[PDB]
């Protein structure tokens, strides 16, 4: 029978068609999944660049700030000595008064 041979042919085309539809579906989703993964990987990279910029700025600003404060420290130390010089005499007489009978 030619029916049996054409039934074989028809089975074959059904299968190729199911297969082709499944492969096209899979490709659409795998393409979107890959594009998604690249989008997020790129976004992580921007985030890491931004982080690095912040890290460099932290180092620089912390160093510049500790330098300004050291200079403020030096000056404040000078002010302490300068202000003590005015009443040095009084301080020495004060101690001698406390210590003598």
């Amino acid at each position: 029978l030619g029916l049996i041979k054409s039934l074989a042919e028809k089975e074959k085309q059904l299968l190729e068609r199911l297969e082709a539809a499944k492969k096209e579906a899979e490709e659409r989703v795998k393409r979107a999944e890959a594009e998604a993964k690249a989008l997020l990987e790129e976004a992580e990279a921007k985030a890491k660049a931004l982080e690095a910029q912040y890290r460099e700025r932290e180092r620089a600003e912390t160093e510049a700030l500790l330098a300004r404060y050291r200079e403020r420290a030096e000056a404040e130390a000078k002010a302490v000595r300068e202000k003590a010089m005015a009443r040095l005499d009084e301080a020495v007489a004060l101690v001698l008064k406390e210590v003598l009978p």
Partner: protein, 187 residues
């Protein structure tokens, strides 16, 4: 037949639905990744700002501490200079006219602290200043060459002893004195 057309349509519609759902799925996945990427970067930036602020705040704390450490150091050096000057003055004091009086006062205080004392001990150069005070009390006078800037009283037969020394008075009281000085000078 009717059934054959129905089934042919079933196969077509199953394939059609598989393909439209795959497309809708692809678009949903991309849209989602877009929104996520955007949200992530904005959240991250805000978090970074906050961290940077805290970093600057810690640095500042460090700086202020550095200023405070400097002031404390400076005061310390001033206080030591005051101490050095006090000690130099005390060292010079025995050459001055009022030294005998200071010696007499140190002896009185030593006697107050050891009223049973039988002798006062002082440097040989200082004894003559105590002669009359000791005679009035009836207590003996003894020379100690290794002793200066002070007077000792001794009870019994050397059983007990009290020392009234200007350098030791300075040294023992310096912790509190330094606070009094700091209030006078600054605070």
């Amino acid at each position: 037949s009717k059934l054959e057309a129905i089934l042919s349509q079933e196969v077509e519609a199953e394939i059609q639905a598989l393909l439209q759902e795959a497309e809708a799925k692809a678009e949903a996945v991309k849209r989602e990744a877009e929104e996520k990427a955007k949200a992530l970067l904005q959240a991250r930036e805000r978090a970074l700002e906050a961290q940077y602020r805290a970093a600057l705040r810690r640095a500042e704390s460090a700086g202020e501490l550095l200023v405070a450490t400097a002031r404390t150091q400076a005061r310390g050096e001033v206080l030591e200079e005051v101490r050095r000057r006090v000690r130099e003055a005390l060292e010079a004091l025995p050459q001055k006219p009022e030294w005998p009086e200071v010696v007499r006062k140190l002896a009185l205080e030593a006697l107050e602290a050891l009223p049973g004392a039988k002798a006062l001990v002082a440097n040989p150069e200082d004894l003559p200043h105590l002669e009359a005070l000791a005679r009035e009390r009836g207590v003996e006078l003894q020379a100690e060459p290794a002793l200066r800037l002070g007077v000792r009283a001794v009870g019994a037969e050397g059983k007990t002893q009290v020392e009234n020394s200007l350098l030791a008075r300075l040294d023992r009281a310096w912790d509190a004195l330094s606070s009094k000085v700091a209030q006078a000078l600054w605070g």
